[PDB]
Every structure is written in C-alpha cells, then in structure tokens.
Symmetry: C4
Subunit: 245 residues, 4 copies
Amino acid sequence: MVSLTKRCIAEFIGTFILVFFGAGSAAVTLMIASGGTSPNPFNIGIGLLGGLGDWVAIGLAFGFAIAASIYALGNISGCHINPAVTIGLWSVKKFPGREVVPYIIAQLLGAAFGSFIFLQCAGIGAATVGGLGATAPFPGISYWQAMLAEVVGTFLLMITIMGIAVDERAPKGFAGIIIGLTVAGIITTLGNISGSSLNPARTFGPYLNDMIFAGTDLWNYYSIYVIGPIVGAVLAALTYQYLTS
Amino acid sequence: MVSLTKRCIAEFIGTFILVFFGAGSAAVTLMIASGGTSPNPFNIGIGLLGGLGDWVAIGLAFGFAIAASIYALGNISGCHINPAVTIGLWSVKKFPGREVVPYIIAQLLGAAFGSFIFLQCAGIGAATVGGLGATAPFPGISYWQAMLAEVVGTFLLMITIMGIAVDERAPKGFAGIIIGLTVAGIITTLGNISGSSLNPARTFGPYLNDMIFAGTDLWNYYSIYVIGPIVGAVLAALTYQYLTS
Amino acid sequence: MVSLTKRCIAEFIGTFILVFFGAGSAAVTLMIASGGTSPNPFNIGIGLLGGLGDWVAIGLAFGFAIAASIYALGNISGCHINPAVTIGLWSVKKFPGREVVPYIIAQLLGAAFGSFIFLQCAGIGAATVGGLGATAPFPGISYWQAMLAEVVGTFLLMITIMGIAVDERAPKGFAGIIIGLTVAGIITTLGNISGSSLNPARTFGPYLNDMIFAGTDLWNYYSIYVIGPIVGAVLAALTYQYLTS
Amino acid sequence: MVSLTKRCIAEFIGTFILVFFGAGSAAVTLMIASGGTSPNPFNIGIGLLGGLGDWVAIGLAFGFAIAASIYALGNISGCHINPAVTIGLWSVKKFPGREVVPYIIAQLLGAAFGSFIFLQCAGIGAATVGGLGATAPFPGISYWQAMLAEVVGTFLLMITIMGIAVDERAPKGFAGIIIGLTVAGIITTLGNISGSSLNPARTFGPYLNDMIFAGTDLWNYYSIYVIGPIVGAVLAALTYQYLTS
C-alpha cells in the first residue's frame, strides 16, 4: 500500500537506527574499557569489565532498537533492514525481485549514515578506540570459522522471521519483540567469535566509516559478512518452506 | 473519559515513578562503585564494575518502570510522562493544545518529587556521589554532541510511540513493554554520551534536587535536554505522519 | 472455580518458587563474590563483580520466576504469592476477606520451604555467606529509609497489578510478564537500599531459615517488610480506585 | 498435521539451536575470562568478570534461542527440544508414547551436532577451556544436591509449559517467550550449582563432544541430568493435572 519511495525511506531509517544504536553500544563498551587490562588476547575489551554481561548488553542494544524499528516501520516497508533478510524472503517468493536492489541500496545507505552520525555524537574515539562496532573475526578465529558462525547465526534469525513474521499462522503483534530478542541472543553467543553481524549492511556502514575516519581497512573480511548471512538466510527460508510444505 | 484533574495526577505519579526508579538506579550504581579505580576518564563509575552491563541495567530500571507505568496509567492519562512526547503528539494533532501545559507542569512536579523522595530513601550520598542520576554531557562530549544524541535518541522513542501506541493499526497490549524496552536500549547506547534523558522532566527533577541538596549547578546544560528531546520528538512525529500519509 | 484447598496449594508452590529462585540468586551472587575486595562499605558483595548488572540479574531471577508462576498458577489461585498483594486486593473488595488468612498462611509456609530447599541444594554457605537472600537495610540506611523504600516499591508493584491484572480493560495475557519485569526493575533500583522485598512472605522465609541455620537474627527488621509493603499496596489500590472512579 | 519425519527434523534443529547458542555462550564466557583470578573456588570463571550478570547473560542466550525456536518450530513439532518435556507430556497423555523415542533420538542427535558445530566455529578452546558448556556439579556441590537442583528447576520449567503451552486456556502467542525467559531465570539461579541443565539432551551433546575433543569424561554425572529433569518434569505435569482437575 505504501509507495516504494516511502518504503525505501523507511528501510533507510530502520537500518540507520540498527547501526547507530547497536554498533554504537559496542563502540561505547570499548571506550569505557579503554586502558583496562584483559586476562587474555581473546578478550579485546568487550567483556573486560562486564564479562558476558557486556555481550548481552550489546546484544540488547541491537535487539531493542530492532524491535522498536519493526513496530514503527513494519507496517510501512516490512522493516527488513538487512540485505540477507530481503534476499531470504525473495528466495521463497515472499518479496518481489524488482524491489530487492532498491531495498538493499536503502539499507546500505542507512547503515553508512547511522555509523557516521553516531561518530559525530560520540567523538573520534568511537572509531579509533571503538572501531564503530565493526564486525571482524576475533583473535584466533579464522576466515572460515567466522563464516560458519555467520551462517548459523543468520539461519536462526531467518527461520525465526519465517515463523513469526512471514507465516500466516504467526501470533499477531509478537514479530518485533521476538526478532529483536533473537538477535540479542545470537550476538551474546557469537559476538566474540565473528562480531555476529548477520547483516551485510550492518557491517558495511562501520567498515566504510572506519576506513574514512579511523584509517582502518577491514574490507578483506567483508565477504564473510556478505556470503555468510545470505547463505544462512536462504538455507533457513528453504528449510522452513520444506518443513511446512 | 477521565477528568483532566485525575489525568494530571496520573502524569505526576507516572513521572515520579520514572525518575525515582530510573534516575535512582544510576545514583545507586555510582554509590556502589564509589572508591573504585576507573581505566580512563570517559568511565566515570557507571561501567566500572559491570561494564556496559551497568548501562543496560540502568536502562532497564527505566524501561521496566516505564512499562509498568504505561500499563497502570495508560488507560487513564495516556501516560506521556515526558514533555517531549506531549509536544510531539500535539504537533501532529494527537493531543489538544489546551492540555499541553497542564500535563507538562504535572510531569515537572512529579519528576521533582520523585527525585526528592528517592534522596530521602537512599541518603544524601545519592546526590553527593550519585548526582541523583542527573543527565549531563560525559567527559570529552561537547554541548552540540550531547544535543545531537538527544535528538536521535528521542527520535527513536517518538517514532516507536507513533507506531505502537498512536497508530490505529498497532497490536493491542504491546505499547507499554515496547516503549519501555526501547528506552532501555537507547540508554544503553547513549547513556555514556549525554546521559540519554530523552525527557525534559526527567532531567529537571534531578537538576533541581542536585542544586538544593548537592550544591551542584547543572542548569547551564538544561537547554540540551529541552531542545534536543523536543526537536527529536517533533521530527519523528512529522516523519511518521509523512510515511503513513 | 478451583477449591480453596487447591488454590492454597498453588499459593504455597508459587511462593516457594519466588523465594527459591529469587532469594536464591542473591545468595549465589554473594557466594561467587566471597573473598573479593569491595570499593566501599555500601557495596556488600552484590555488585562487586557485576556492578548494577548483579542487581538486575537478581531482579530478573525474581521477575522471570514470578512471570512463570503467574502463567502457571494465575488461572488457579490468582497467583498472589505475596501477603501485601492479597491484602491490597482485599482493601478494594477484589478478594474475599474470608480467604485472606488462608492465602497468607500458604504463602508464609511456601516461602519458608522454598528457602529451606534452596539451602539443601546450594549448601550451608547459601546461608552463612549468602544469608539466603534475606532482605535488610543496607549500610548507612536507617529503619525509616528502608520503610519508605518498601512503601514506594510496593506501591509501583500494586498499582501495576491493578492496571494489568485486576482492571477489566487490561490486555489479556500480559499480566504475568509485566508484573514480573516490574519487580525486576524495582529490585534493580531498591535492592541496595532495603533489599527490595515488597513481600512479607518473601522476607519471612529467609529470616526463618537464617535464624535456624545461620544463627542470624534479623527479626528486629521484620516490621519494615510487613508494614512497608502492606501500606504501599493498600495506598496503590486505593489510588487506582480513585483515578478510575 | 506435519509428518513425523519433518517433526523429528524440527526437533533436531531446535535442539541443535538450543545447544549451539546456549551452551556456546557458557563456553565463550570461560574463554574470555581465562587467565583471570577468581575470589574463591566456587567461582570457576563464570561470574569472574560479570558476577551474576554472567549467569543471566548465559541464561538469556539459552532463553532467547529457546523462544526463537518455539516461534519457528512450535507449529511444526511442538518444539519440545528436551527429552524431559517429551516424557512429561507423555505422562499426562498429552503426547503419544509411540513418538517418544523418535523425538528423544532426534533431540540427542541435534544436541550432539549443535555442540560439534559450535566447536568448529569457536575453536578447540571452546572445549579445552570452556568445556563446551557441559553441565556438572560445581565445587562443593554433591551428587544429590545437584540432583535436587535439577528436579526443582525442571519442575518450574514443566509446570510453566503446562500452564502457557498445554492448557487450552493459555493466552495465545505467549508460550515461546515465557518458556524461554523462565529457563533464563532458572539458569541464573541454578547455573552455579548444577549447571542448570533441565534437559538430558542439552547435557548429552556437550558431554559427547567434550569426551571426543577435550578428553574430558563427565559421564559419571550424567544420571543427575537424566533422572533429575525427568522426575521434576513428571512431578510438575502430575501436579498441574491435579490442581486443574
């Protein structure tokens, strides 16, 4: 019912929110932990002061912002705010192919602006110390291990979306909060492994701004956050379709 | 249906609750962390013992109290308990202008009393050490950076309120919990930047009591917490109206 | 519809659950923090390792157990599991006076057994080190300050119960989770002040077992946890009745 | 309506998710805390950096994954993902005996694969340092104390399932989130006592992989996690049936 123009604006706003608040909380954690001594290399600062509590806090900053976005924009654009979700829905004929690129562009732009505006609010340290919450393999984690993490994590996210937001039998009203909390849980577990992106746009924004303002080049890892989420999402969509066929 | 007198009493109670429990949790955090050594100046004590866990805990003390208030008073006054929300609703003709001042006065009074009564329960240290949870720019954060944070934070709060509480299509029953959790998430991210007020009354109460009992004068920062939230709220209300027009 | 005998058994089980899981989490926190160095006297161990994160964790152990109990027993006994709630409902003619004593006795017994069984699971240290999560004024907090805290805290709890569980306009299904989360929020704020009991039975259980197994006599503080909660609950019930009259 | 083959696949996926994300978060906590100094023997690393905050974080990693699974698979297989739940339902004629073994086998297999795949993502340290989140009595806790903990914990889980998912009067849509949060709360309290398994399969997976990849033999404790959960679940199912008879 809503025009594609307005729906793309909604996707831009939703992804802006996702990155500003979610990735922002991770940058803040590193900023307030800066100067502290970590027990081992695997602990880079997130978890130094609050242990796994730091990870569930970041997970919830993402989760509550995602839930808020879905309740505010779900009835407008569907609030995908994730290229992997858009592609996942498309793979099972739940979203028109003609609108896939428009949505993804809006999401990438929203993520980039969200990261940029957060940097303006928090200061340069959000990038030089916090890395603007950019997702990258943690110490000792290989390219393929991070890839596997993103596939499994996005699989859970997408299969949940299929059951609570796509399925006609889904209980009305619960989609936003369940999807957000599911993301919070996935980040709590996978955050210290791959950064738990589950979203190509959510990784794109911080990567772009880190490059421009922190002189940090993480693009060599970007394929992990493109292939991993997309593969996990499509696999989940196809699996759900099979189980309910 | 409920008289303006009773609705104003409800707004007073709701804002009293918001400040007593929310701002109170921040004061308590500083009180139990007093004497500890922080890794750097940006970390003022909140996050010293629990990292970002401290921030999501404060965010939830606010969030759960807000949710409770909305379920208890929503059907009475609408439970705005925030001058920026009242003005935001007014800007899109969702609340009568003739009741704006009455509601705001009730909110300011409730916030002041909530802070005062908390001070009586917790002791003078809640103000001298905890600053009664007053919101102010954190170390290294400028006036305009804090302003930008309040605009973005209140924008998310208000657009969520529009979608889940104002919109006729909103799923019934979810407003209270979603609004509260959204605030918890915003505080988790922005707490260590501007204090994440999102509410002129929530800042007014602690400021007044800090001045009277802690000899702390933060009024020079008050414009941040008046202009920021109001601008963000109106911008969100107008944006929602546009997207759904 | 359910007999008083079965409803009393339900109240016993519900209060047993409330104390076993809620008060138990507080004892565990102190047990895992034992031996650590606190920054100041106000911090007794809860918050030493996780800051306010420790308090919201205890609050949620209580909150999730309360929500679970309400969804499991609400349709049976009404799941009051709190003498102050039973009395509050009675004060506004929402519960028969003839069943007040039966419910309270069941609640007191359930709390005592819950604390006892937890002690058996966790070991003697749950009492000698953790104090079985007994509520008492914290360092520097006077008898009247703790009393005021219990009144305000129980006021919020009861007014929320009136709006989401008692009121005929309340959205169905939300009562359990909202009541539980409200308690979690109140404990997060007031835990380090009065222990945030809000419940005469929840205090009775640990007090009894601490006396028998820890040789700790806290009965001199019990009036705080009887008068405070009851006054707050009745005041809230009467206030709600007035606002909606 | 869904074939047993597809329902068993769903149970496999659901239990895989439960173990990968839940048990995985516990392993991660130990990995990021490795090298730190604990205040006492009872604190093995979980709680070292975040106190009880670490436990509620692990509890929520389990809880959010469980909620997600129920919303995604509940309408397919019923999403038991726990042998004790399957047996509990069977004991009160709410699940056919002919499908009990098929479901349990699927659950055991899913748990084993979930643990294995997590090990691949996180690295060998997830097992050698994190023990893949295997549940075992904590320091000072005897075999019978851990057994009692599992009985009480699973009793709460099952009685909640009866009231919110089995009972025809249960409010629609709430089952997934309430069951998940209930588990989070139980783990917060009992995690540092018995590991708070409440699930024979959730313990089986980590035990198997720890044996194969960590050379750790915990099978001598397995009876605790088989008998405890099953006894608690059946006792709860029978109790609910009695109270509502």
